[PDB]
Amino acid sequence: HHHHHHMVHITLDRNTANSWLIISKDRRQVRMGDTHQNVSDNKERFSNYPMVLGAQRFSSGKMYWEVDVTQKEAWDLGVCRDSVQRKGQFSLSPENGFWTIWLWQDSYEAGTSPQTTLHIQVPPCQIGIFVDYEAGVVSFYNITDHGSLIYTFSECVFAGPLRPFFNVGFNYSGGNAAPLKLCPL
Numbered sequence: 001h002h003h004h005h006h007m008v009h010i011t012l013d014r015n016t017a018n019s020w021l022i023i024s025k026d027r028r029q030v031r032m033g034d035t036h037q038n039v040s041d042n043k044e045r046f047s048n049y050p051m052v053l054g055a056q057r058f059s060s061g062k063m064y065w066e067v068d069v070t071q072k073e074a075w076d077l078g079v080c081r082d083s084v085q086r087k088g089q090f091s092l093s094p095e096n097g098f099w100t101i102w103l104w105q106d107s108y109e110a111g112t113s114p115q116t117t118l119h120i121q122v123p124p125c126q127i128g129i130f131v132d133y134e135a136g137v138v139s140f141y142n143i144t145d146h147g148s149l150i151y152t153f154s155e156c157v158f159a160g161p162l163r164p165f166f167n168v169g170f171n172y173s174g175g176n177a178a179p180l181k182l183c184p185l
């Protein structure tokens with residue numbers, strides 16, 4: 001892929017974070033805390049899962065960013081509508097306003113309904129996310145494996161502004177404490 005030149009500087013929006021998340025000073029890293037992080041509740045915060053949004057909103061154009069997932073056992077990444085549900089239980093699907101992939105229990109899957117098995121030969125340490133708003137495309141790239149394609153959502157019906165979407169995953173195992181990091185341009 002030659003999408004690198006649509007690179008955008010993403011920062012995390014503290015106000016949207018689940019109350020257990022710890023976002024770094026530079027708003028470029030997020031990890032699961034071992035307790036509630038002493039913030040007030042608000043209607044924006046994801047309540048049921050360790051999720052957070054990027055601050056940036058996209059309604060046109062081509063955008064690209066990269067995320068470090070080194071030594072995590074579980075995470076979700078992609079984009080979502082600004083209007084997605086924040087409270088209660090829900091599935092990650094385009095019908096609910098999400099265009100995502102994930103790692104869970106040693107397999108990679110795309111967040112279709114039902115989910116799609118991904119075929120990755122080289123476990124990624126960094127993921128590239130490309131959005132073409134006008135074309136209705138969200139693509140995922142394996143930066144560890146020379147930028148190889150992971151998955152393309154096409155015919156996307158965004159139906160609103162998009163925000164970068166992150167889930168650091170649960171850390172029930174003690175093996176998933178590591179952060180998600182936005183990688184430099």
Ligand SMILES: CS(=O)(=O)NCCc1ccccc1
Binds near residue numbers: 032034048050170
């Ligand atoms: C073992 S743990 O640290 O990952 N426990 C997390 C508890 C939690 C439940 C729902 C949403 C956010 C956090």
